[PDB]
Amino acid sequence: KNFVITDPRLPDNPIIFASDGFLELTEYSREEILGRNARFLQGPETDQATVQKIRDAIRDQRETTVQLINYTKSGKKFWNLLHLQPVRDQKGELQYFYGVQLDGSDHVL
Amino acid sequence: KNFVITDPRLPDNPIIFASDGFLELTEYSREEILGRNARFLQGPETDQATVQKIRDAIRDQRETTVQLINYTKSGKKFWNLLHLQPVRDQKGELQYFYGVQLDG
Numbered sequence A: 001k002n003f004v005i006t007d008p009r010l011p012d013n014p015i016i017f018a019s020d021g022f023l024e025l026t027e028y029s030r031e032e033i034l035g036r037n038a039r040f041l042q043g044p045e046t047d048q049a050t051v052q053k054i055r056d057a058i059r060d061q062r063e064t065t066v067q068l069i070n071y072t073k074s075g076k077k078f079w080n081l082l083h084l085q086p087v088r089d090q091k092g093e094l095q096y097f098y099g100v101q102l103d104g105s106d107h108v109l
Numbered sequence B: 001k002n003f004v005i006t007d008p009r010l011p012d013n014p015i016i017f018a019s020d021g022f023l024e025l026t027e028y029s030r031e032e033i034l035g036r037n038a039r040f041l042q043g044p045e046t047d048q049a050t051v052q053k054i055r056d057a058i059r060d061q062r063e064t065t066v067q068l069i070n071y072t073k074s075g076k077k078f079w080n081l082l083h084l085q086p087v088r089d090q091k092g093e094l095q096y097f098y099g100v101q102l103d104g
């Protein structure tokens, strides 16, 4: 299904890997999204308290699961059930982050 | 949940990334699997015809979805619903394979 990998060691933690399900989910091409921060999926109705929560889980470098409003390339509004997981190397060094994305409406339970 | 990514530019197509779900699923640590080809999950009652199928999809550089007996570290049997996906670069060269696993 849908997942991405970001590189926090790079400027602004860009997406550096994107699965086919993620492209299908967002209506974006892999060219369009590699090198960018995932925040591009956010828009007007997106709750900032939730974004701050994501900002906080990333700062602390801990995993989390949230539900926030995202937008496809064509402007379609969806609940993104978003799970983050930090990844450290063999010496406890943060190397990446991973994200698994779900359409919350397709998965209300 | 469970996903690995492999590099087919490197010899023996090793696992270069693994999600925690795959760690939890297979009972291995990230250390024990990075740099290794995912075939170590295979074992004695694993269908070799299913293995040749995977090996075909990899050579053909196309996606497949198969199901096969795999083994956790402690030697526990599970039916692995395995989906593979080839990944090219912008100029069309094969750069990665990704895999999603399900306990069937």
Ligand SMILES: Cc1cc2nc3c(=O)[nH]c(=O)nc-3n(C[C@H](O)[C@H](O)[C@H](O)COP(=O)(O)O)c2cc1C
Binding pocket: A004, A005, A006, A013, A037, A038, A039, A040, A041, A042, A051, A052, A054, A055, A058, A068, A070, A080, A082, A084, A085, A097, A098, A099, A100, A101
């Ligand atoms: C691995 C990973 C995947 C992410 N996926 C999404 C996503 O699918 N949708 C979204 O709105 N934000 C996603 N984010 C969060 C944004 O990339 C960003 O971290 C968040 O908006 C906080 O950044 P900001 O407050 O500076 O804008 C993801 C973050 C990470 C680390």
Ligand SMILES: Cc1cc2nc3c(=O)[nH]c(=O)nc-3n(C[C@H](O)[C@H](O)[C@H](O)COP(=O)(O)O)c2cc1C
Binding pocket: B004, B005, B006, B013, B037, B038, B039, B041, B042, B051, B052, B054, B055, B058, B068, B070, B080, B082, B084, B097, B098, B099, B101
């Ligand atoms: C990304 C990826 C993930 C894979 N995951 C598994 C797996 O979970 N279980 C398994 O038995 N084989 C898995 N394989 C297949 C083996 O790594 C290998 O391709 C298969 O054994 C055929 O190669 P071989 O005949 O040379 O061993 C995966 C392959 C790739 C490319």
